[PDB]
Design a protein around this ligand. Structure first.
Ligand SMILES: Nc1nccc(-c2c3c(O)ccnc3n3c(N)nccc23)n1
Ligand SMILES: [Mg+2]
Lengths: 298, 262
């Protein structure tokens, strides 16, 4: 590519280092999303460098496809396959119906597939929230926005502490652990699972401490029994209130036994015991999974 | 534990083994460079080691930069006065990919002793990205080493730091190390470090993981052993100085073995 072959249709989003347009290839008909990255005095943003290099390798049905990079002096365009909306807007549009269980189950299964593929290719996503999960009219859901992602090594080193939009942020990040790993993305997807079922955020804190306490009030304040080493973590305080763990059927009341089992394994405190995306695919919850079209017009 | 990604380790290793072949520089490129030599490249890589020390960069970042340089020079003829510009843009790109806090671009201009302007560095950054097609997530010696380390019984810091030191020495000398893949240099570096420090050998568990044996590693090991023996005399000395530091357990002060008995 390109550029002269693209016909911009409308602005669809924004945008730290730029803007996203819906556009169409005038010659092939292909509808695309064009992510414009503004250039310059530090040169190409490290977020753009990571998003592009990491997505070059990640070809999977549940990861948004980077089609091309249009690379010039003052502009950088990332050309992506077009997806019709994000999960957040889908949840809002499903306000009164709710999302049918077969769709929630289909979407979780696809997200786990997409994530396991990332992790098998040494990529942490590190910002899984419904806004970064895009859906099409054929029933696909895909991981998007890898600006915050990281290629990791085995075993992991210390990476950026900022990490993950607060509501979806794992307790080991909040407690300042020197290391975090693939488990952080599973924690996020567990929050998303609950959210698809309720259509409201599981842990909507307004600060790190508020976030932690909201988690503790739902899952119990973790001790050495539930999470070996927890009390030695940098930002753990002996003064933390010790909340009792809720009956888990009370966390997401409309969820069936298999659903609650999987959710509980995704929200395990101990990152070492938390379920992996790969193992989760084989969970009894998915025994009857299908891939239906969304019930609403997109 | 999860930090060692038990559920993905094997997939990752397999993936890296595929990518290293794809990301491999051309073995014979220096022959096709009219104006630059292995020796000039050695000066460059040794300078990059100093830069990484000055700015306290990850060793990973240094490995990446060298991969980017060697790949760039596999297709682009470069005059001697522009070699350091390629090197500097490569280290900038590697830092942005790999560092939590990469040095500012001005910091990169500063360490070139103002040979180049900020505009040149930034234009070279763009050019390197174009030539490499943004394919920056390359496997390094270090990415294999840290996986191999998990097979020690038990873990030994001198073994780890020494293996790293040896892998780092290989970055300096395109002849012969351009011949060998990162996974193979890491394997020879790990065996040689294990042998120097503990008298042990490349373990069976790593034959199982990698399919490499002492016989398949022999050529690289013979090269690396000689490099280790000759290291005090090499014209480039920044890695040796670097590895005297307590940070790396002073491993460059250890004496190489006189024979490998392989
Ligand atoms: N509205 C909005 N805001 C930010 C990003 C995006 C976005 C995106 C993005 O940020 C990264 C990759 N793909 C994206 N994408 C696709 N493929 N289709 C439609 C939208 C979209 N869309
Ligand atoms: Mg030459």
């Amino acid at each position: 590519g390109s550029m002269e072959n693209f016909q911009k249709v409308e602005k669809i989003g924004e945008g730290t280092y730029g803007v996203v347009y819906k556009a169409r290839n005038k010659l092939t008909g292909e509808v695309v999303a064009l992510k414009k990255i503004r250039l310059d005095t530090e040169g190409v943003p490290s977020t753009a460098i990571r998003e592009i290099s990491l997505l070059k390798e990640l070809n999977h049905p549940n990861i948004v496809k980077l089609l091309d990079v249009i690379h010039t002096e003052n502009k950088l365009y990332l050309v992506f396959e077009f997806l019709h909306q994000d999960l957040k807007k889908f949840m809002d549009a499903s306000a009164l119906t709710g999302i049918p269980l077969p769709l929630i189950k289909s979407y979780l299964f696809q997200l786990l597939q997409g994530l396991a593929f990332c992790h098998s290719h040494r990529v942490l996503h590190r910002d899984l929230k419904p806004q970064n999960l895009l859906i099409n009219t054929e029933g696909a859901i895909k991981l998007a926005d890898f600006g915050l992602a990281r290629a990791f090594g085995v075993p992991v080193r210390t990476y950026t502490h900022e990490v993950v939009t607060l509501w979806y942020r794992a307790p080991e990040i909040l407690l300042g652990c020197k290391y975090y790993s693939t488990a952080v993305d599973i924690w996020s997807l567990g929050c998303i699972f609950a959210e698809m079922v309720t259509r409201r955020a599981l842990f909507p804190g307004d600060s790190e401490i508020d976030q932690l306490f909201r988690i503790f009030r739902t899952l119990g304040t973790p001790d050495e029994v539930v999470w070996p080493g927890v009390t030695s973590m940098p930002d753990y305080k002996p003064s933390f209130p010790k909340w009792a763990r809720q009956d888990f059927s009370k966390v997401v009341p409309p969820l069936d036994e298999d659903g609650r089992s999987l959710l509980s394994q995704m929200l395990h405190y101990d990152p070492n015991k938390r379920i992996s995306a790969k193992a989760a695919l084989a969970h009894p919850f998915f025994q009857d999974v299908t891939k239906p079209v969304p019930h609403l017009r997109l | 534990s999860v930090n060692e990604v038990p559920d993905y380790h094997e997939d990752i290793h397999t993936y890296l083994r595929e990518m290293e072949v794809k990301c491999k520089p051309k073995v014979g490129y220096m022959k096709k460079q009219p104006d630059i030599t292995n020796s000039m490249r050695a000066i460059l890589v040794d300078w990059l080691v100093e830069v990484g020390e000055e700015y306290k960069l990850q060793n990973e970042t240094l490995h990446l930069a060298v991969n980017y340089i060697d790949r760039f020079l596999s297709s682009m003829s470069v005059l001697r006065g522009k070699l350091q510009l390629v090197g500097t843009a490569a280290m900038l790109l590697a830092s942005k990919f790999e560092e939590i806090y990469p040095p500012e671009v001005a910091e990169f201009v500063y360490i070139t002793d103002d040979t180049y302007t900020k505009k040149q560095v930034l234009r070279m950054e763009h050019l390197v990205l174009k030539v490499l097609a943004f394919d920056l997530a390359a496997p390094t010696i270090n990415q294999f080493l840290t996986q191999y380390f998990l097979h020690q019984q038990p873990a030994n810091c001198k073994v780890e730091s020494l293996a790293m030191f040896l892998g780092e020495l290989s970055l300096i000398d395109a002849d012969p190390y351009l011949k060998y893949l990162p996974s193979v240099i890491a394997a020879a570096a790990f065996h040689l470090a294990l042998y120097t420090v503990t008298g042990q050998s490349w373990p069976e568990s790593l034959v199982q993981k990698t399919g490499y044996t002492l016989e398949t590693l022999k050529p690289c090991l013979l090269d690396l052993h000689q490099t280790y023996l000759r290291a005090p005399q090499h014209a480039q000395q920044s890695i040796r100085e670097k590895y005297k530091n307590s940070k790396y357990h002073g491993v460059s002060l250890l004496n190489p073995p006189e024979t490998l008995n392989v």
